[PDB]
Amino acid sequence: VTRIEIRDVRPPAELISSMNAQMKAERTKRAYILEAEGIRQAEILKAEGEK
Amino acid sequence: QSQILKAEGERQSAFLQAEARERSAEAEARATKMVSEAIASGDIQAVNYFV
């Protein structure tokens, strides 16, 4: 009747880094976009000053 | 956006320069009339001496 479970699935140490690099990379995207927005607004303001 | 703002700046500058140009032309016209009368009255050797 078991409903056979796998209690735990361990990869070795080498594979874990490769597996969580995905989510680290997905996090860097948000930071990059936010920095881009900051740059955009700063440039607009400086242009007004120069005008 | 920066480029558009800059361009507006040069537009306003050009308008001001046009006004200044008209004023300077007025001054040149008055000068021409006065020196023309002075030369037509007396002589031309004096201008050569000054030059």
UniProtKB/Swiss-Prot annotation, chain B:
Gene inactivation effect: No visible phenotype.
Top-level taxon: Bacteria
UniProt subcellular location: Cell inner membrane
Family label: Belongs to the band 7/mec-2 family.
Subunit annotation: Forms oligomers. Probably interacts weakly with FtsH.
Role: Identified as a multi-copy suppressor of an FtsH/HtpX protease double disruption mutant. May play a role in the quality control of integral membrane proteins.
Name of the protein described by the UniProt record: Protein QmcA
Organism of origin: Escherichia coli (strain K12)
Gene: qmcA
Residues of the full protein shown: 205 to 255 of 305
